[PDB]
Write a protein that binds this ligand. Structure first.
Ligand code: CA
Ligand code: CA
Lengths: 200, 200
């Protein structure tokens, strides 16, 4: 199994191996040892969440306030979603950049470190996503940026009408969140990553 | 969400809540905070494994050598399995007892602490089980007892022919493992549980 960086620093793609035989398959979907080798730290699992989404449901762009924010390891267990990581970190060389990854097989997982924005859209009806998070979900620490903001310009799938929740529909754009001081700061994100590597 | 003990000390049933709306559902499938409240410790997640099994495939009865053995939080994400926890602990008041739980919905999960034996049979073709484990899988520390041993007398489902791997077919019975000193000791299991509660 491999874990390699994506184009936004802090996002990683994990490709995991299937051992198959006549009885079915075994897969190591998540390995703390593999993550510590790639990242320098074990993110820990405080919560595992599962979300079932109707086709075209767009969940995002969400992030937890830093610190400690939430790091996420995301896998689509059935069906397919288009996952988009967004660099919401002010002062980042790639601030406002995004990258889309198709998660359409259980052997591909996305790791998003603390301080990045995460989103996905369900490409199939009732797509199931599981995600491990380093910190428990807390509504009070949870923030959102509108996923269709033209200031981000995410290329959501052609031909699928997005379905947003009330909360995601009324979410501010990135430029509003920026000037209100509600986005993470890139140097604070880097220092947090270094702190995790030093724990002990 | 609730987490309550089963009939074998060390096995627990977790029932988790679904928040459903027109867009799908959100579920908190695993909560370290909930586990620490029930158990006195956070087991930690070293690995998440996923197994797909043909109908009638019987995986088990498996256990990792104590210590540190492996604690397992098991959920059937799709289809149905019959999970059987076995009290393999010599000196236990319930040594050789077992309990079957039908895992046929993603909102029910079984927690098996370090030192118990775990098994399941797939009731549907291609049933998918995910499980979180406190320690990484290591073949050298992994042991097995034959799941059809009449000395355990597990009531596997009526009308389904069991399909075992070569390794599970050639697995010894519980009485052989006992006299060869390959089963966990109940007082060692209890002392290990107390050690986890004292860590810090
Ligand atoms: Ca697929
Ligand atoms: Ca069901």
């Amino acid at each position: 199994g491999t874990m390699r960086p994506l184009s936004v620093q802090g996002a990683w793609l994990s490709e995991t191996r299937a051992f198959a035989d006549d009885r079915g398959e075994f897969q190591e979907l998540y390995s703390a040892r593999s993550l510590r080798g790639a990242l320098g730290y074990d993110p820990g699992v405080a919560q595992v969440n599962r979300s079932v989404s109707r086709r075209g449901v767009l969940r995002g762009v969400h992030f937890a306030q830093l610190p400690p924010s939430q790091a996420k390891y995301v896998t689509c267990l059935s069906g397919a979603v288009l996952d988009v990581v967004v660099d919401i970190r002010t002062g980042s060389p790639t601030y406002r950049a995004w990258e889309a990854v198709r998660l359409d097989d259980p052997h591909r997982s996305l790791y998003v470190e603390a301080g990045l924005g995460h989103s996905f859209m369900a490409l199939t009806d009732d797509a199931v996503v599981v995600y491990l998070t380093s910190q428990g979900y807390a509504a009070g620490r949870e923030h959102g940026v509108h996923p269709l903001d033209p200031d981000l310009g995410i290329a959501w799938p052609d031909g699928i009408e997005p379905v947003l929740s009330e909360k995601d529909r009324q979410a501010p754009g990135i430029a509003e969140m920026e000037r209100r001081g509600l986005l993470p700061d890139y140097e604070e994100c880097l220092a947090f990553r270094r702190s995790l590597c030093e724990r002990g």
